[PDB]
């Protein structure tokens, strides 16, 4: 197998990787329901998706579903 390092990490870099995930995910979830996938199997991806949207938007700068949804509040960082 591969040992040592798996590339380098960056702010503007990881983003490019996420974007792809947001797309692929959305699809994976669509097919899951289209094939009557197990409620458990689907849920798994579901949650992940909701996270991707954030890890993507936030990274860029936009707030995570700030305006969308009531429960999800801006909740800024303090430190």
**Exposed, middle or buried, 57 (CB in 10 Å: 0-12/13-18/19+)?**
middle
CA–CA dist 18, 60 (Å, integer) = 11
The Cα–Cα gap between 79 and 75 comes to 12
Q: Would you state the structure tokens that stand for residue 48, as one six-digit string? A: 């992940």
Domains identified in the chain, total number = 1
CA atoms of 3 and 39, how far apart (whole Å): 37
Method: NMR
Which domain range does residue 40 map to?
A: 1-79
Q: Is 52 exposed, middle or buried (0-12, 13-18, 19+ CB in 10 A)?
A: buried
């Amino acid at each position: 197998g591969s040992s040592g390092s798996s590339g380098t990490t960056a702010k503007p870099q990881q983003i490019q990787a996420l974007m792809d995930e947001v797309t692929k995910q959305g699809n994976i979830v669509r097919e899951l329901k289209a094939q009557k996938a197990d409620k458990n199997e689907v849920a798994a991806e579901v949650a992940k998706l909701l996270d991707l949207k954030k890890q993507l938007a936030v990274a860029e700068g936009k707030p995570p579903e700030a305006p969308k949804g009531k429960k999800k509040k801006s909740g800024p960082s303090s430190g």
